[PDB]
Design a binder for this molecule. Structure first.
Ligand code: HEM
Ligand code: HEM
Lengths: 394, 394
């Protein structure tokens, strides 16, 4: 006798398990057990992943319901699971989205300057350098302070919540509430601070005092700041880190992008496609009985959309493990999700990675791992896959 | 068909695998495969572990021989594997050992002051606190700068070598050589620096200019500094970290030691006994054919002495998983090894942990984990077991 197949499969973010292709072939929707002991349906083909993400009867909001089968414990108040819906209902969606594009004058130059300063510091200090803790994550943090309009010096403390806030735990996490409440208080203070006039928080601060938003709660305004800082920083820092591993392990590609930096956007799209940063499938709760492939999913059941299932599906992306800069369907990957909950930071995430990679290749064209790849330490029981340190030489 | 049993079993340092007791019962010496692909004999009973450690025909030195079966790749030059032998041959053993006791006037007060300052800073900042990165490891680092006689401000850079220097890798690690060579250069400079007059390096600096040591190499003097700093810092920081987990998970014991701090030495001895800090068995190479239990170990074979095998052996320590402060054989554990290579820092390691625990319990009597214990992230492919962060509240 063997137990029901457990998820997640592996915390390693440098390779996809051979087992994913076998599951996709044999049983592209199949029952699994999550870390809480709940059962769920794991969906692993491009076709079925798209179907689930584009049918809102597979609900994000309802995953927060009391008594639902859970992927993991909430690390935010249950109403915050519906954050984007709350933003939309408040009439804030257009303004929030506009504030988090890469388009504000000076933003891209700020990114480039920041990346180059971080890299110059590493070069001065001498190899080895840790490209996660001393490049990708500080670049993400600096970017998001700028995007939010908050002081750069406040970034590190907000950043330090994230190793707990984005845990994927079987049980509630007391530290997550301590940090959440503190970070909310910080954002509430920002909204009251007359010096904060730019970025997302500057704009929210103005809208909060406009009559058209008089009955939008101060709680929601503060929540937008905490959620967007955290989601953006953890996702961009983690993606850039693991994209750098993918690049470093492909000297031919590294050299090509170094020689022809105009190809970096196409390279980043492929790096997004093959990215293993999301450690769990995206959760949804069925609100009706719905046929998904050979399975009739029942109302109240949990569905997990495995992004690397879709993104490595050879029926959609032939030779899926290879980075090919000339695919006919390059942005059709699910790295940013799909449907109602498609990532609102996608353009900013792309630009962060493009600029970070461009700067690194110019400054460190000889970049290579400084330890054997198996020596990287992969963070466990976390919503993202990342190496704790990324030691390189150049 | 199944593969030969692989070592190590688990990087988690908060619990011993049920499998260790089964191996000890069924096959207290048995064949395993190491991360390099080599075969080895894993020894897991107190009786057989002692036998191996007390027979120098199971040689530490010879593990460094070219072409030997390996537990892991060398991270130091092969001659440095025989460091203690080299020290003894140079006539330096007595002086080195004397410099690394906890006995120098002011040392214990320095430890207490340092621990209390670190804890006061955590209390000011507010929970959660990371007791590894912001307590145990800085306390270890500060201690070893003091013991060596080197500037406190030089500690962090030397410390940063350790996440690579103590890797347990299948292959050589290029960063380990970069850091090794740099740290040797640092210690060579210390030996030439007239300001360095105290501690281990102050004493070595004097002996280096004494006629009785004129033909001891400058390489060996520098090597003593790098090796003792690294071994001491990694071992004490890691032991204190995982001992704190053991304590925190035993509120009754925490409270008892808080109430009766005179029991802390007995508590630390039990914490040493149950400690899972060594991630691999201690390696030795047979230099003769030697009977160990039911196995005739052949010349040239690798033997791995599993310390938790010995220390959790119920035939030697009844109710081995329980901390009992009134055992009749309390220091007879193998936490510091046994025989020729018994830890030369044992007294200092004991005092570091005793003082750290005493200070923590006084300052944070309510100390508890701030995350569920399964959320700790255990470092992989490392010579020690440690959580990357240890989040607590109080
Ligand atoms: C390369 C970096 C990024 C990746 C790979 C990424 C990925 C994703 C994915 C897969 C989702 C969908 C979750 C689901 O459907 O369950 C998502 C949603 C989200 N992303 Fe991103 N993201 C990135 C960057 C950003 C940035 C820069 C921000 C904001 C500054 C951001 C904010 C959000 C938020 C707030 C959501 C939730 C949307 C909702 O619930 O409707 N992300 N992201
Ligand atoms: C609680 C903390 C410590 C623990 C648990 C510990 C454990 C051990 C063990 C098990 C060995 C034996 C290795 C073998 O036989 O293969 C050893 C050896 C050694 N220890 Fe420690 N140690 C600690 C603290 C220290 C300190 C504070 C120092 C120096 C300042 C130190 C320096 C060394 C050195 C240099 C060796 C190698 C001895 C040899 O090769 O003969 N250790 N230690």
């Amino acid at each position: 006798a063997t137990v029901l197949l457990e998820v997640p499969f592996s915390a390693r973010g440098d390779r996809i398990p051979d087992a994913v292709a076998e599951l996709r072939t044999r049983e592209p929707i199949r029952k699994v057990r999550t870390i809480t002991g709940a059962e769920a349906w794991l969906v692993s083909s491009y076709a079925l992943c798209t179907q689930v993400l584009e049918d809102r009867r597979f609900s994000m909001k309802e995953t927060a319901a009391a008594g639902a089968p859970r992927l993991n414990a909430l690390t935010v108040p249950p109403e915050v699971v519906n954050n984007m819906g709350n933003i939309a209902d408040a009439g804030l969606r257009k303004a929030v989205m506009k504030a988090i594009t890469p388009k504000a004058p000076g933003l891209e130059q700020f990114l480039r300057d920041t990346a180059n300063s971080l890299l110059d510091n590493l070069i001065t200090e001498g190899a080895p350098a840790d490209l996660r803790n001393d490049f990708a994550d500080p670049l993400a943090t600096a970017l998001h302070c700028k995007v939010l309009g908050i002081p750069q010096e406040d970034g590190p403390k907000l950043f330090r919540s994230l190793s707990i806030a984005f845990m994927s735990s079987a049980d509630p996490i007391p530290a997550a509430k301590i940090n959440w409440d503190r970070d909310i208080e910080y954002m509430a203070g920002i909204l009251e601070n007359p010096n904060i006039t730019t970025g997302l928080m500057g704009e929210l601060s103005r809208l909060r005092k406009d009559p058209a938003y008089s009955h939008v709660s101060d709680e929601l305004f503060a929540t937008i700041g905490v959620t967007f800082f955290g989601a953006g920083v953890i996702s961009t820092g983690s993606f850039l880190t693991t994209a750098l591993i993918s690049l470093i392990q492909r000297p031919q590609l590294r050299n090509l992008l170094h020689e022809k930096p105009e190809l970096i956007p196409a390279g980043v799209e492929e790096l997004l496609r093959i990215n293993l940063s999301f450690a769990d499938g995206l959760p949804r709760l069925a609100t009706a009985d719905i046929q998904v492939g050979d399975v009739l999913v029942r109302k109240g059941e949990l569905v997990l959309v495995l992004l690397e299932g879709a993104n490595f599906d050879p029926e959609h992306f032939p030779n899926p493990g290879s980075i090919e800069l000339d695919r006919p369907n390059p942005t059709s990957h699910l790295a940013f999700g799909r449907g109602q909950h498609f990532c609102p930071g996608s353009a900013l995430g792309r630009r962060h990675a493009q600029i970070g990679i461009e700067a690194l290749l110019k400054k460190m064209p000889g970049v290579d791992l400084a330890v054997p790849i198996d020596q990287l330490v992969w963070r466990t029981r976390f919503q993202l896959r990342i190496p704790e340190r990324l030691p390189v030489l150049w």
